[PDB]
Curated annotation (Swiss-Prot), chain B:
Catalytic reactions of this protein: alpha-D-glucose 1-phosphate + H2O = D-glucose + phosphate
UniProtKB keywords: Hydrolase, Periplasm, Signal
Residues holding substrate: R15, R19, R92, E194, H287, D288, S289
UniProt protein name: Glucose-1-phosphatase
Protein's GO biological process: glucose catabolic process
Keyword Signal: yes
Gene from which this protein is expressed: agp
Function: Absolutely required for the growth of E.coli in a high-phosphate medium containing G-1-P as the sole carbon source.
Species annotation: Escherichia coli (strain K12)
Recorded effect of pH on activity: Optimum pH is about 4.
Amino acid sequence: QTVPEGYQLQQVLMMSRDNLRAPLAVLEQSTPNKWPEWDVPGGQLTTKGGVLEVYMGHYMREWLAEQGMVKSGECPPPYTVYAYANSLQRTVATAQFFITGAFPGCDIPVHHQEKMGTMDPTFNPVITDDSAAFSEQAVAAMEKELSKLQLTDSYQLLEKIVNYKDSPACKEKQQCSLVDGKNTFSAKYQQEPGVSGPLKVGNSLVDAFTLQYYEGFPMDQVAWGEIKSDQQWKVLSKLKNGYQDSLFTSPEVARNVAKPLVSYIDKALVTDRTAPKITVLVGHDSNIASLLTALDFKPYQLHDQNERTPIGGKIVFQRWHDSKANRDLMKIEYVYQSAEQLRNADALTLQAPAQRVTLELSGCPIDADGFCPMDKFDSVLNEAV
Amino acid sequence: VPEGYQLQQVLMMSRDNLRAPLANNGSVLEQSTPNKWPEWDVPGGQLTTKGGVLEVYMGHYMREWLAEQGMVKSGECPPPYTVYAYANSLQRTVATAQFFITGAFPGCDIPVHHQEKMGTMDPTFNPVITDDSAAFSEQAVAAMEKELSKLQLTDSYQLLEKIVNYKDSPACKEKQQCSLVDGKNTFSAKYQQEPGVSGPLKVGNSLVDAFTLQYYEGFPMDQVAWGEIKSDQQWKVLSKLKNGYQDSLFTSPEVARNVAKPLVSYIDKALVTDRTSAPKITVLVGHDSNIASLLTALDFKPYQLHDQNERTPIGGKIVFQRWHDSKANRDLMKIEYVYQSAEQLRNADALTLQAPAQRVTLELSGCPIDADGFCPMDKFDSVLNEAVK
Ligand SMILES: [Zn+2]
């Protein structure tokens, strides 16, 4: 929040993911209960998700205006803001809501490749190394990452919540447990790192419950009212976070699958002394997770949030101009909404701000004010490519 | 919807959503009271973020309703030239259109059309007088004075003076006007300008409009008119000024039929056409003046919105619907006012088919409505073609 004297914000790039969506229904076979209905088809952005993106867009507009990047009440000059989303409905819609919330009444288009419904290679977290050595090390890293996690209590709580014993996947079986199930990881070329087993089942169930919570469903219709404490949410979130960490937090997988994004960021921020002053990239949680590991971010902890890359969350890269020393500096923040802010659709203003956490690259150590030298930042980006 | 009816074309007449009041130093709002107006997150005259959110909810509801009637396939973007969005070239109207379109068709490439000169009025949405004859100006002012004479606003003026502390206001400290009950109103009906009024009518309308917008924005109750509005009857008494302001300016048939002539002309062209590659869904975003003049020009029957103290509310939209009777091979017209209640506006409630927006079936005097809210298409175009003439 503190800006040293003489510092002028010059450039900003935001790495974002799709907002609150309808789950793509594992969900039916894992429970006898009836899942509550959604207003939108599965995989599409919900109206609440668009509203949450609008609020975040307005806050980002207020913050940018406070730092002199754009003038509040006037549309920025043409080509000042560049919005780029993956060619999926939820990513394009997320970008549209954010841009309209940030610059209502301006003519700022959301760029995307023509083939809608297909992944854009820039946002496609697929493996591009076809060598056998890569796949062996990648799978080993995923299993090593999963080995650190203790998910037995999470599986037990999930089985109790969904009544797993009476589910279609359990009939004809005397004992039916996800605790003893085996997880098999995959690291195939031109495909995303995946996993089969109880990890995927638990991730899908807890993700569905998380989306129900943020959507604003009555509490008795969120996991059928079975989640009764914050600790239970924390125990269940281990499954979602463990799924994400195993697949995209291993450094071997992350440096390969996130290569197009790091290349785009290095091109758009470092070797871009030309022009886009505000860049908004709308991808997926996988892109953010792999990017965080690829750039060797230090570990961080979000407040009032049990996810690592939650909806509405954005990684804001900020190039600042130190006027006294005539040098550029880099400051990176995670600007996100708390669980309460998401569920309640709280308005975000400078007085009632979104949550902010200063991030740090292992290669770009931050000072007491969260800034690090721009040359070390470009060095890290060039070493990652 | 009777069996065999297929919705073929839809035009929605809308206004700008919740905006920030213009309360600078020289403003009517500042001069009318000594109290401090609560500050807004947006510059004056700009659309508020909550207002955009309200349009988003209304946009999603309209998408759900349109899908329910088979106009568009839910979750899929309509063909390119299917949706045409056209707004007045102002920030609040264009932003309102952008929020509605994104809420209705998230992820589609549907642009909001507007003339290039932003900050200036679009002739289609500009309710200015296009008749330069003096006789027209004479009759226009006479009709406005006659319409206002019918209204009883004494209790409204007194309550407003008490609420705003008008006696200690700048408009009385330095301008020598100090009462809204005894104040004089002067109407204007000049060529190439909007019908206007000066006096307590304009002051009261601006003050009550600010209080209503404060309510919809979600300000704490003590910051809505400084906490002085304490009952729904007081809201009704204050709303009398706003309704009287709108009626005096735009309920004269001559003035309304003239200032709204470009808008009625567009609606008649965009609705009666069954042409190839024509837009099936039209969204026109103007101002409450446009809706008021349109209501009088087409000779709408009186209507009552419920759970709403306004006649042309912020979120409300007039949805013209051309339906095709497949059994009888005839076209029919059904007009509805789709709006949000005051609670829905203030609370920013989501609008779904399960929890819908408010709907009221409207009726044209020249197109009598049947038991199902439909009227024949030929009578509707007849009314429209006579109004454009
Ligand atoms: Zn570089």
